[PDB]
Amino acid sequence: IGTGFPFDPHYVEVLGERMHYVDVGPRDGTPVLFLHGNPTSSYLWRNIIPHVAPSHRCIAPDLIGMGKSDKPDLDYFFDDHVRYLDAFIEALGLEEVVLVIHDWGSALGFHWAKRNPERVKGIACMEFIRPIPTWDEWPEFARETFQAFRTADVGRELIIDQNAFIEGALPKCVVRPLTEVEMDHYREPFLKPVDREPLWRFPNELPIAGEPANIVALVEAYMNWLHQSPVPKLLFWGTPGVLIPPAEAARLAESLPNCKTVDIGPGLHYLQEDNPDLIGSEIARWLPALHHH
């Protein structure tokens, strides 16, 4: 599994701030927009993009405050990310897209799709955010960790002062061991502790046990949309998974229209780090039949 990031930097000025993005592939078709989550960046897609780029443009932004993007001193609520990504997409003049989404990138992507359904030709998703209505529906192994993350004292100590999301949660949610070169790519945006604000606000935004109410309602709305949308869907899942365990992936295969599921084998949350070649090759194989209108 490759550790390098052989992608030239692109930047666009959005809402006073620069966002970095990968942009490769032909420009005369429907682009594939790759959206990472917490605490990652476009680096997460580095071994998936090469499968798709031969046939399609690949656009992979770094969310504001993350990756190589600028670091405004925001609260980094979900709504901040929505504003920046909405503006990013318009700045690039994107019309129709295919989405490839993960974690908070999936909340952003599904929220954008709900609001722009005529512009989404397909959604490839994995380990995505839906409401977690009670703490018992959160995976046991990660429950006391995320309960501690979601506090103003201990959560800030762990995530901001001690970098626990990068040094702890990220590698704990990859089955194979991450190498130190890979870890240094993930560490680089966050070398200075104060810059870790988005890494703390994100778990505090997760729709768990009814809280925060605004996000629970938003996420319920895009999931209602998704369950009734004919849009083609491609859902990758692993065992045991984290947000989408095997039995829930199977339920989604049945409850989501025009949904193809792909078993990637062992996986927790960052499935792209356990089996990027199957994810990339299956996305590439799925794109052509989405073209026709």
| CB of residue 163 to Cl ion, shortest distance in Å | 14
| CB of residue 291 to Cl ion, shortest distance in Å | 34
The smaller minimum CB distance to Cl ion, of residues 112 and 138, is found at 138
CB atoms within 10 A of CB 54: 11
The smaller minimum CB distance to Cl ion, of residues 78 and 88, is found at 78
| CB of residue 34 to Cl ion, shortest distance in Å | 18
The one-letter amino acid code at 131 reads P
How crowded is the C-beta side of 289, counted as CA atoms within 13 Å? 11
Among 34, 128, 202, 237, binds Cl ion (CB under 5 A): 202
38 binds Cl ion (CB under 5 A): yes
* 237-256 binders of Cl ion (CB under 5 A): none
Which tokens is 269 given?
């949350």
What is the total count of residues that contact Cl ion (CB under 5 A)?
3
The smaller minimum CB distance to Cl ion, of residues 38 and 40, is found at 38
Which tokens is 161 given?
């002062």
146 binds Cl ion (CB under 5 A): no
Let me know the angle formed at the C-alpha of 55 by 50 and 58, rounded to the nearest 5 degrees. 55
- Which span (34-42, 89-97, 171-179, 254-262) binds Cl ion, by CB under 5 A? 34-42
Q: Has 269 been annotated as catalytic?
A: yes
Among 105, 109, 155, 203, binds Cl ion (CB under 5 A): 203
| CB of residue 29 to Cl ion, shortest distance in Å | 33
| CB of residue 263 to Cl ion, shortest distance in Å | 25
Q: Has 95 been annotated as catalytic?
A: no
Dihedral sign (CA 185, 186, 187, 193) = positive
Q: Has 17 been annotated as catalytic?
A: no
The smaller minimum CB distance to Cl ion, of residues 189 and 203, is found at 203
Query: Of 62, 103, 273, 274, which one is the catalytic site residue?
Result: 103
- Which span (36-44, 114-122, 236-244, 245-253) binds Cl ion, by CB under 5 A? 36-44
280 binds Cl ion (CB under 5 A): no
- Active-site residue numbers? 103, 127, 269
| Footprint of Cl ion (CB under 5 A) | 38, 202-203
